C-alpha cells in the first residue's frame, strides 16, 4: 500500500515519486 | 482511501493532485466524506 508522506518514507517504504498537492511536493511511499 | 489513477477520479472522489511516478502524471483522488 502506498503512502503521501512528507518528507521520508518509513523502514519498511521505498519511494516512488511524488504527490503534488497544491504546488507542494510531497513524497509518494509504497511497502 | 486515496489512490493514484489514470485521467479520472471515480465519480463519489475527490480529486486532491497528482502522483509523479516515472514519466507519468498520475491522479491523486481520495474517497468523498
Redesign the interface.
Given at each position: 500500500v502506498?503512502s503521501?508522506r512528507l518528507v521520508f518514507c518509513r523502514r519498511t517504504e521505498l519511494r516512488?515519486?511524488?504527490?503534488?498537492?497544491?504546488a507542494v511536493?510531497f513524497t509518494?511511499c509504497c511497502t
Open positions: 502506498c503521501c516512488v515519486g511524488n504527490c503534488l498537492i497544491g511536493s509518494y
